[PDB]
Amino acid sequence: GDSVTQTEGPVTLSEGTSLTVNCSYETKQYPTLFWYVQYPGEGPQLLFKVPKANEKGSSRGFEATYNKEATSFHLQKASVQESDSAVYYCALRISSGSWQLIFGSGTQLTVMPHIQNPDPAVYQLRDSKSSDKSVCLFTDFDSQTNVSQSKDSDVYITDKCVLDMRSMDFKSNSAVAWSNKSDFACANAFNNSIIPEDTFFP
Amino acid sequence: QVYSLIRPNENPAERHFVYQFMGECYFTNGTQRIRYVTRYIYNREEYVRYDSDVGEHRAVTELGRPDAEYWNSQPEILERTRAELDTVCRHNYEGPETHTSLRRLEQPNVTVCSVTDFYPAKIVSSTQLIRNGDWTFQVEHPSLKSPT
Amino acid sequence: DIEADHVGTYGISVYQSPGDIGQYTFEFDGDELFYVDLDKKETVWMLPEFGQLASFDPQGGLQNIAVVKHNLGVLTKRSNSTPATNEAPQATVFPKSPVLLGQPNTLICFVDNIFPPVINITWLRNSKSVADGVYETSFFVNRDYSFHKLSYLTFIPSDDDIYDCKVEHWGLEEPVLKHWTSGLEV
Amino acid sequence: VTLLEQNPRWRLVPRGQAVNLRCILKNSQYPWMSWYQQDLQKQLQWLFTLRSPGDKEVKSLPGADYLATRVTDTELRLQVANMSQGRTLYCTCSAELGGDTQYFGPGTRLLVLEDLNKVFPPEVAVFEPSEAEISHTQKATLVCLATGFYPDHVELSWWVNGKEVHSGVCTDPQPLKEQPALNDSRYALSSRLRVSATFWQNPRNHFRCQVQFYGLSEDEWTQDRAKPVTQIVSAEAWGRA
Ligand SMILES: *[C@@H]1O[C@H](CO)[C@@H](O)[C@H](O)[C@H]1NC(C)=O
User: Where does chain D show beta strands of DSSP type E?
Assistant: First the structure.
């Protein structure tokens, strides 16, 4: 059987650290080896290929060596960027049948952005008419912060999300919590999370 | 185990016409020397050829000039054709043929000495080597420890 | 003429129009490893044993046919070339093994100089049509880009029987008949 | 520019039904059209490569029966039947047979739904930014909530002054289960659009959150609540100082 096996993941890395996604392949044929990348909301697309055994290929700072003796095609990047968050697929093709691609299972990578000036805070948005929800916004925290689920009833909490305001060269994490209850207040919304001591409640 | 195959290249784009493509692998001393040739034939005329001794497609007749030039001008097309010496010729010879063709040994039977039904072909008056088409021949053999 | 210990042809893709007539084979030293049945989408090994020791994905043949089908169409629209004329095929009939009366054997009809590769090869015994026990090969390529093909008849050799290989082809005004009897010499 | 279009982009497939997918090749110089499936665990797998008009082929994989057809030089089709598990179907194209660069189309996402009654459209509310955030940061974060929806066949977008904006936007990668223990839980999704405080403080600015829901379409419905057909739901807010 012709097959591809790669790191199970999911992988999470801080921006600027190095990535290794392992890929083994098995075939008696002479394969061409590939990495494909799939960014959120998009279809797969080719990252790079290597048709000659023991050669290297590279693209967007990623590289991989077609190591014939180890039957490996490990993906490496010395310094991941936030825009590298994606699913990475190792694949092979052999000159047989329809010359089709055989894909590994894929390895998801999340790159947490570097937040130079953390400004952690929980803000209360203005109550909306046509909605009984009260919305809190935990924002501007370090990537060291993780957001935990609520242990309170009828409170909904979404995980951290990175928004990019390009024209200000500025990135920030945020998480949203909302609820119906009157007991709900932003001061206690995120109490199950371990947040910065200096977090600011207005 | 698994035969791989050659990929013919594609033209960019009531009378009876015949088209023929062939990918030929020539072996000497096992795979110590491999020569690889593809042939594109139209209407009984070879009109484009790739020959590993040359390393690019050539027009065998003027009709083939646009197609040989196109296939040579696309780096992926040209490199993938070049690579078939290794991915098809060498792979097949060292893999599957080692389990099939290169191991076949059929012992020959013996106013007339009918030496029949043998394979491979190395073996007062005897007609030329005739090919039965069933992987045997008729007309001291690799299939025999001793020569009546 | 290229010198070599062996030649593998991996493979051979033949296509004709009109009629959408395709053929895909592999060869080694002039013998057919397999053809791909293009209608059944199946690899057909000439030696069943080889099909038990190795494998070949028939889709590779199907895709080769799609390529040459497209290539032929472009070439036909692009060329002003007149189609090559029909050839007259030539047939030879010989037994596979030494004739021994009462001992089963196979009669081989070898048909050469076939062009185009469209032909009818059939057998007669004492002028009577014989459909049972008949096998024929794919069209084998020749150096001059004509083809050859072999048909086989299993039979019991007896003194009286007269066999004919009958060949019908566009390059023949009338069918050609090649004869063989048990006493005959090739 | 894009080489392929795929219709439909989402479909719910009742059991015992089939669906017909199209892949349209926009550039005939990439005539090698293929189908690949991607299953719910993200495994990709080739299905078909069909070069010539008239080509047709069937294939049965775990979870779905396939009939693929090359209808014209620019038209590839797929009938999916007996679908017991959802999946995504990608059309791909290349300039040559098995070309090194397979271009993947936008994809058709198929889901089996057992109970048409479990389908709900989203409720969409937008929440204006906190004055405290404006005071501390000089930036204003709006939040859009899409709640109560099922299945998770939604696309959320922001529109500022009629123009869809991508900058300063973040929508959750995954939706939230509003009923964590249920296998057919309804979903919530949150999105944030962050702008300059001065941009939010000028009342000449229209912010709109829009959610595209994919559902039953004009399917048999009996409940007294509104039929959850494919539709759109939005919520707006102009600037305020
Ligand atoms: C190549 O063939 C020659 C004779 O044909 C033989 O003596 C030799 O051992 C073979 N291989 C090498 C590596 O020389």
Answer: 4-7, 10-13, 19-25, 32-38, 44-49, 56-61, 64-72, 75-81, 87-94, 103-104, 108-112, 123-127, 139-149, 154-160, 163-165, 169-171, 176-177, 187-196, 206-213, 231-238
Backbone phi and psi for residue B94, each to the nearest 5 degrees, phi listed first: -85, -15
Q: Are D21 and D40 in contact (CB under 8 A)?
A: no
Which residues constitute the domain of residue C157?
A: 90-181
Closest listed residue to residue C163, CA positions, set C186, C138, C137: C186
CB contact under 8 A, B3 and C46: no
Q: D29 and D107 share a domain?
A: yes
Q: Is residue C131 helix, strand or coil?
A: coil
Q: Which of A129, A95, A75 is nearest to A27 (CA)?
A: A95
Question: What's the rounded Cα separation, in Å, for the pair B67 and B21?
Answer: 14
Domain range for residue D53?
4-112
Q: Rounded to a whole number, what is the distance in Å from the CA of A94 to chain D's nearest CA?
A: 10
Q: How far does residue B29's CA lie from ligand 1's centre (Å)?
A: 7
Query: 58-87 in C: which are within 8 Å (CB) of D?
Result: 63, 66-67, 69-70
Report which protein residue has its CA nearest ligand 1's atom 13. B32
Using a CB-CB distance cutoff of 8 angstroms, which residues of chain D are in contact with residue A6?
Answer: none
Q: Which bin fits D54, alpha (ψ -120 to 50), beta or left (φ > 0)?
A: left
Q: What spacing in Å lies between the alpha carbon of B88 and ligand 1's midpoint?
A: 23
Q: Give CA–CA dist D29/A193, Å, rounded.
A: 54
Mutational test site, ligand 1, from B29, B31, B33, B34, max ligand atoms within 8 Å of CB: B29
Q: Are residues C100 and C166 in the same domain?
A: yes
Resolution (A): 2.0
> What CATH number does residue D213 fall under?
2.60.40.10
Contact B7 D99 (CB under 8 A): no
Asked if the Cβ–Cβ distance from C71 to B5 is below 8 Å, we say no
Distant-in-sequence, close-in-space partners of A67: CB < 8 Å, separation ≥ 6: A54, A73, A74
What are the φ/ψ torsions at residue A167 (nearest 5 degrees)? -75, 0
Q: C114 pairs with which residues across the strands?
A: C147
What whole-number distance in Å separates Cα of residue D125 and Cα of residue D147?
Answer: 9
Domains in chain A with CATH codes: 3-112 (2.60.40.10), 121-189 (2.60.40.10)
Residue-wise burial string across D188-198, b where 16 or more C-beta atoms lie within 10 A, e elsewhere: bbbbbbbbbbe
Asked if D4 and D91 touch (Cβ cutoff 8 Å), the reply is yes
Bridge partners of residue B97, in order along the sequence = none
Cα distance from A172 to chain D (closest Cα, Å)?
Answer: 9
CA nearest ligand 1 atom 8, residue? B29
- Give the angle subtended at the CA of C106 by the CAs of C105 and C110, to the nearest 5°: 155
Is the backbone peptide bond immediately before C104 cis, with ω within 30 degrees of 0? no
Cα separation, D190 vs A177, whole angstroms = 9
Element (H, E) at B66: helix B65-73
Q: Report the domain count for chain C.
A: 2
D97–chain B nearest CA distance, Å: 8
- Is the distance from the beta carbon of residue B28 to the nearest atom of ligand 1 less than 6 Å? no
Mode of pairing for the β-strands spanning C105-114 and C90-95: antiparallel
Task: Count the neighbouring beta carbons within 10 Å of the beta carbon of residue C50.
Answer: 23
The answer for D 38-67 residues in CB contact with A (under 8 A) is: 41-46, 49
How many angstroms away from the CA of A4 is the closest CA of chain B? 18
CA distances from C36 to B4, C43, D189 (A): 14, 5, 53
CA dihedral B122, B123, B129, B135 (to 10 degrees): -60
Chains interfacing with A (3 or more CB pairs < 8 Å): B, C, D
CB contact under 8 Å between B3 and C18, yes or no, is no
d(CA C161, CA C145): 36
Q: Do D52 and C67 touch (CB under 8 A)?
A: no
